[PDB]
Amino acid sequence: METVAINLSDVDLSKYITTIAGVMTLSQVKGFVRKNGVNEAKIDEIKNDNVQDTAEQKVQLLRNWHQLHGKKEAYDTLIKDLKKANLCTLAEKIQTIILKDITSDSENSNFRNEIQSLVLEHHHHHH
Numbered sequence: 001m002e003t004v005a006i007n008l009s010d011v012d013l014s015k016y017i018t019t020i021a022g023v024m025t026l027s028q029v030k031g032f033v034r035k036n037g038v039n040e041a042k043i044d045e046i047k048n049d050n051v052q053d054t055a056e057q058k059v060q061l062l063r064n065w066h067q068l069h070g071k072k073e074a075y076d077t078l079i080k081d082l083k084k085a086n087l088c089t090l091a092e093k094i095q096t097i098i099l100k101d102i103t104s105d106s107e108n109s110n111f112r113n114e115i116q117s118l119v120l121e122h123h124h125h126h127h
Contacts, residue, residue: 008102013074016097017066020078021058023093026050029058033065035085036077 021029034043042064050057069077075098082091100108105126111119120127 008075008098009072011073011075011098013070013078014066016075016094016101017062018059019097020090020094021056021062023097024058024062024090026054026057026061028087028090029061032082032085032087032090033061033068036065036068036081038065038068 024032030043030047034040038061043061046057046061046064050060065078066074079091079095082088082094104110105119109117112122115122
């Protein structure tokens with residue numbers, strides 16, 4: 001009957017770009033955005049600007065690619081492309097980040113904001 005058709009339509013690709021670069025590297029994220037239609041000249045400025053800096057530069061390149069797409073199923077482009085950019089490693093760590101967002105109803109603690117703390121009242125059906 002059509003089988004499961006995925007459910008990450010509201011991935012909201014934009015907040016995981018920072019938490020993702022944390023586990024990613026500077027050379028890894030580099031070949032990523034550059035190998036995703038993010039303009040090679042653009043990464044050129046972001047390359048010499050920090051030849052030896054992996055602090056925030058990680059979210060600088062990743063974020064530059066986020067504004068590129070940002071629309072629908074953008075999360076599928078970050079994972080599928082991360083594997084097509086000769087990496088097959090960055091898309092894994094980030095895979096766990098998003099998996100926690102949707103699965104943050106037990107191993108997380110950011111749902112009852114300005115209401116209480118646990119989970120039950122503000123919700124859709126789960127207790």
